[PDB]
Curated annotation (Swiss-Prot):
The chain holds residues 27 to 158 of 158 of the full protein. It comes from Yersinia pestis. It is found in: Fimbrium. Keywords: Fimbrium, Signal, Virulence. Fibrillar structure, part of fimbriae, necessary for full virulence. Induction: Expressed inside macrophages under acidic pH and at 37 degrees Celsius. The keyword Glycosyltransferase does not apply. The gene is psaA. This is pH 6 antigen.
Length: 141
């Protein structure tokens, strides 16, 4: 019953200084069965909550619905509802993007609370790449 859908967004991302907050990825997750909440752990090179250019540049991602705990290295939201959670990760206006591909890896865990603690009852590794286009080339001689 545990389902996860992590996907990059489609088309129209332009290299340069973003004029607004821009979704890079979207995440949909849900469960009818009893649960405590959800985290997304940014894994590997995404550790710290980042996207990674094949070149090696890191870009900071934010979560619209979840909160970030640096110490634990995850985004979480506590939710018990059997309703679908629709989050996405985005970069903040003013972020400079480069006309390249950016990877994101991490792991999505569902959890439970029995009294004092959380345990992982379900998990899914997730990844995604997002390709940023150049607009017009600009040639100055
Ligand atoms: O509210 C439960 C959450 O508590 C935070 O401290 C933790 O980093 C998350 O991973 C999740 O356990």
């Amino acid at each position: 019953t545990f389902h996860v859908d992590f996907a990059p967004n489609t088309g129209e991302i332009f290299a340069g200084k973003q004029p607004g907050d821009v979704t890079m990825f979207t995440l949909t997750m849900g469960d009818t069965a009893p649960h405590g909440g959800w985290r997304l752990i940014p894994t590997g090179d995404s550790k710290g909550g980042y996207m990674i250019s094949a070149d090696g540049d890191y870009v900071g991602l934010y979560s619209y619905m979840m909160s970030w705990v640096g110490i634990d290295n995850n985004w979480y939201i506590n939710d018990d509802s059997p309703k679908d959670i629709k989050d996405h990760l985005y970069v903040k206006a003013g972020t400079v993007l480069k006309p390249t591909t950016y990877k994101f890896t991490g792991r999505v865990e569902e959890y439970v609370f029995d009294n004092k603690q959380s345990t992982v009852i379900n998990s899914k590794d997730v990844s995604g790449e997002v390709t940023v286009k150049q607009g017009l080339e600009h040639h100055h001689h």
